[PDB]
Enzyme design. Structure first.
Site, PDB file in Angstrom:
ATOM      1  N   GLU A  11      54.903  82.428  90.609  1.00 24.52           N
ATOM      2  CA  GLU A  11      55.553  81.457  91.491  1.00 24.52           C
ATOM      3  C   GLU A  11      56.691  80.658  90.849  1.00 24.52           C
ATOM      4  O   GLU A  11      57.050  79.589  91.336  1.00 24.52           O
ATOM      5  CB  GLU A  11      54.505  80.519  92.113  1.00 24.52           C
ATOM      6  CG  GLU A  11      53.523  81.260  93.030  1.00 24.52           C
ATOM      7  CD  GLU A  11      52.501  80.345  93.688  1.00 24.52           C
ATOM      8  OE1 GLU A  11      51.534  79.938  93.012  1.00 24.52           O
ATOM      9  OE2 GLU A  11      52.662  80.046  94.891  1.00 24.52           O
ATOM     10  N   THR A  16      62.827  85.246  94.123  1.00 29.76           N
ATOM     11  CA  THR A  16      63.812  84.502  94.898  1.00 29.76           C
ATOM     12  C   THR A  16      65.214  84.699  94.297  1.00 29.76           C
ATOM     13  O   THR A  16      66.189  84.863  95.028  1.00 29.76           O
ATOM     14  CB  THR A  16      63.424  83.021  94.978  1.00 29.76           C
ATOM     15  OG1 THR A  16      62.089  82.928  95.510  1.00 29.76           O
ATOM     16  CG2 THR A  16      64.388  82.248  95.881  1.00 29.76           C
ATOM     17  N   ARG A 146      57.003  83.399 100.623  1.00 34.36           N
ATOM     18  CA  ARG A 146      56.259  83.683  99.402  1.00 34.36           C
ATOM     19  C   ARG A 146      55.385  84.907  99.561  1.00 34.36           C
ATOM     20  O   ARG A 146      54.488  84.928 100.405  1.00 34.36           O
ATOM     21  CB  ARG A 146      55.367  82.522  98.974  1.00 34.36           C
ATOM     22  CG  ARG A 146      54.690  82.822  97.626  1.00 34.36           C
ATOM     23  CD  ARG A 146      53.515  81.914  97.348  1.00 34.36           C
ATOM     24  NE  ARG A 146      52.504  82.015  98.394  1.00 34.36           N
ATOM     25  CZ  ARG A 146      51.287  82.525  98.226  1.00 34.36           C
ATOM     26  NH1 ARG A 146      50.913  82.980  97.035  1.00 34.36           N
ATOM     27  NH2 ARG A 146      50.442  82.574  99.253  1.00 34.36           N
ATOM     28  N   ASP A 168      62.095  93.053  88.435  1.00 35.93           N
ATOM     29  CA  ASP A 168      61.286  91.910  88.840  1.00 35.93           C
ATOM     30  C   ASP A 168      59.833  92.353  88.752  1.00 35.93           C
ATOM     31  O   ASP A 168      59.484  93.438  89.216  1.00 35.93           O
ATOM     32  CB  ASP A 168      61.655  91.529  90.276  1.00 35.93           C
ATOM     33  CG  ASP A 168      60.890  90.336  90.793  1.00 35.93           C
ATOM     34  OD1 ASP A 168      60.376  89.544  89.977  1.00 35.93           O
ATOM     35  OD2 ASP A 168      60.814  90.186  92.034  1.00 35.93           O
ATOM     36  N   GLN A 172      51.716  86.408  87.669  1.00 34.81           N
ATOM     37  CA  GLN A 172      50.311  85.998  87.563  1.00 34.81           C
ATOM     38  C   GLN A 172      49.577  86.827  86.512  1.00 34.81           C
ATOM     39  O   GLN A 172      50.003  87.949  86.188  1.00 34.81           O
ATOM     40  CB  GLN A 172      49.590  86.076  88.916  1.00 34.81           C
ATOM     41  CG  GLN A 172      49.880  84.871  89.825  1.00 34.81           C
ATOM     42  CD  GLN A 172      48.916  84.772  90.993  1.00 34.81           C
ATOM     43  OE1 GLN A 172      48.166  85.708  91.277  1.00 34.81           O
ATOM     44  NE2 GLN A 172      48.930  83.631  91.676  1.00 34.81           N
TER      45      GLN A 172
HETATM   46  N1  GSP Z   1      62.154  74.437  97.008  1.00 36.23           N
HETATM   47  C1  GSP Z   1      62.253  75.461  96.165  1.00 36.23           C
HETATM   48  N2  GSP Z   1      61.467  76.577  96.349  1.00 36.23           N
HETATM   49  C2  GSP Z   1      61.583  77.616  95.490  1.00 36.23           C
HETATM   50  C3  GSP Z   1      62.469  77.578  94.422  1.00 36.23           C
HETATM   51  N3  GSP Z   1      62.352  78.743  93.747  1.00 36.23           N
HETATM   52  C4  GSP Z   1      61.431  79.519  94.366  1.00 36.23           C
HETATM   53  N4  GSP Z   1      60.959  78.826  95.458  1.00 36.23           N
HETATM   54  C5  GSP Z   1      59.913  79.235  96.409  1.00 36.23           C
HETATM   55  O1  GSP Z   1      58.689  79.321  95.687  1.00 36.23           O
HETATM   56  C6  GSP Z   1      57.916  80.418  96.140  1.00 36.23           C
HETATM   57  C7  GSP Z   1      57.609  81.335  94.970  1.00 36.23           C
HETATM   58  O2  GSP Z   1      58.812  81.906  94.474  1.00 36.23           O
HETATM   59  P1  GSP Z   1      58.836  83.454  94.045  1.00 36.23           P
HETATM   60  O3  GSP Z   1      60.250  83.890  93.909  1.00 36.23           O
HETATM   61  O4  GSP Z   1      58.067  84.341  94.959  1.00 36.23           O
HETATM   62  O5  GSP Z   1      58.124  83.355  92.608  1.00 36.23           O
HETATM   63  P2  GSP Z   1      57.797  84.608  91.649  1.00 36.23           P
HETATM   64  O6  GSP Z   1      58.156  84.229  90.267  1.00 36.23           O
HETATM   65  O7  GSP Z   1      58.513  85.819  92.091  1.00 36.23           O
HETATM   66  O8  GSP Z   1      56.193  84.690  91.803  1.00 36.23           O
HETATM   67  P3  GSP Z   1      55.263  85.949  91.384  1.00 36.23           P
HETATM   68  O9  GSP Z   1      55.778  87.196  92.120  1.00 36.23           O
HETATM   69  O10 GSP Z   1      55.374  86.179  89.871  1.00 36.23           O
HETATM   70  S1  GSP Z   1      53.634  85.549  91.912  1.00 36.23           S
HETATM   71  C8  GSP Z   1      58.751  81.128  97.189  1.00 36.23           C
HETATM   72  O11 GSP Z   1      58.294  80.670  98.435  1.00 36.23           O
HETATM   73  C9  GSP Z   1      60.157  80.612  96.988  1.00 36.23           C
HETATM   74  O12 GSP Z   1      60.865  80.514  98.203  1.00 36.23           O
HETATM   75  C10 GSP Z   1      63.258  76.448  94.225  1.00 36.23           C
HETATM   76  O13 GSP Z   1      64.051  76.373  93.280  1.00 36.23           O
HETATM   77  N5  GSP Z   1      63.134  75.395  95.102  1.00 36.23           N
HETATM   78 MG    MG Z   2      57.723  87.707  92.637  1.00 35.55          MG
END
Ligand code: GSP
Ligand code: MG
EC number: 3.6.5.-
Length: 316
Positions: A11, A16, A146, A168, A172
């Protein structure tokens, strides 16, 4: 040919950043593509209000108005639709009344005590828009969805005459064993950290502070000699959420020795120094640190423009 690898805990914003490359370099998500995210938007919305309702039971929080109990019952009766990409006016009304309840809001504001999607408020505050007939997710709605990443996602785009391949992976704990499959031929690592994680605990482990977990991963990646010649880019992400949170949640929850104020600049700098100090070879290994809001296209565009120039200069 430039291989970019996104790494970071769950997360942190990795996927994103991926979506943003499509928006910035490939003219965004088409209408058919946006319609595919409709069920994801509805699923996130329903899961978020349900997660809060679940927490009220655990934390023993009452609805502000007793009339909400019947709405909560109707929520589960009607929730099945949302999961299938449909949102009736009746379900929307139920969720909206629940979301406005002072008891639900009290629980919402204690979200660090459980697990809540960061986009909960974003969707829930926009119910009138997303519940409308023939709703089609906007670019931002898509950015805000998400879905936990499992396996490895590979995306392509062209920028500054260069052909980028972006990888990507899930962050987790269950997915970290897959990171090594991506380790070959990496031009630059973009390591994402959720700044707002500082007072949260891992979904996989309620005893582990989320930011401490991120530090351990960064320590591992940054100092891995396999990556000696790989550019290490550090995105201190979720700066928007961090800016709001630092006002009301002490940074000392995460770093007991923090003596600065509850304000964005001092606290952000302190976290940056915490991660950068993990670099065991400061004179021979540079970390390129940027503060980002991954959902904010303009911010990502300018940051990644700056990052890309660095990558070109140092690896081309
Ligand atoms: N407000 C806000 N939300 C964010 C920001 N960066 C990511 N998000 C939100 O947080 C949530 C998780 O981001 P995501 O891109 O899915 O994380 P990830 O690193 O890919 O997560 P994982 O796949 O390892 S579990 C998503 O809903 C995304 O829209 C940010 O800078 N600001
Ligand atoms: Mg991801």
């Amino acid at each position: 040919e430039v291989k970019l690898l996104l790494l970071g805990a769950g997360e942190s914003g990795k996927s994103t950043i991926v979506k943003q490359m499509k928006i910035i370099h490939e003219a965004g998500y088409s209408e058919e593509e946006c319609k595919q995210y409709k069920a994801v938007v509805y699923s996130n919305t329903i899961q978020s209000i349900i997660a809060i309702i679940r927490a009220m039971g655990r934390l023993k929080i009452d609805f502000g108005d007793a009339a909400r109990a019947d709405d909560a019952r109707q929520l589960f009766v009607l929730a099945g639709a949302a999961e299938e990409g449909f949102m009736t006016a009746e379900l929307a009304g139920v969720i909206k009344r629940l979301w406005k309840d002072s008891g639900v809001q009290a629980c919402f504001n204690r979200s660090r005590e459980y697990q809540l999607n960061d986009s909960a408020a974003y969707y829930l505050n926009d119910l009138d828009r997303i519940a409308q007939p023939n709703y089609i997710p906007t670019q931002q709605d898509v950015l805000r969805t998400r879905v936990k990443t499992t396996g490895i996602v590979e995306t392509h785009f062209t920028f500054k005459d260069l052909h980028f391949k972006m990888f990507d992976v899930g962050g987790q704990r269950s997915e970290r064993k897959k990171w090594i499959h991506c380790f070959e031929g990496v031009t630059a690592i973009i390591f994402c950290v959720a700044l707002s994680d500082y007072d949260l605990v891992l979904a996989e482990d309620e005893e582990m502070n989320r930011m401490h977990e991120s530090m351990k991963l960064f320590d591992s990646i940054c100092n891995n000699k396999w990556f000696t010649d790989t550019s290490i880019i550090l995105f201190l992400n979720k700066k928007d959420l961090f800016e709001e949170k630092i006002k009301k949640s002490p940074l000392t929850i995460c770093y007991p020795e923090y003596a600065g104020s509850n304000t964005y600049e001092e606290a952000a700098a302190y976290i940056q120094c915490q991660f950068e100090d993990l670099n065991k070879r400061k004179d021979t290994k540079e970390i390129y640190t940027h503060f980002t809001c991954a959902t904010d296209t303009k911010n990502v565009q300018f940051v990644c423009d700056a990052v890309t120039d660095v990558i070109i200069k140092n690896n081309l």
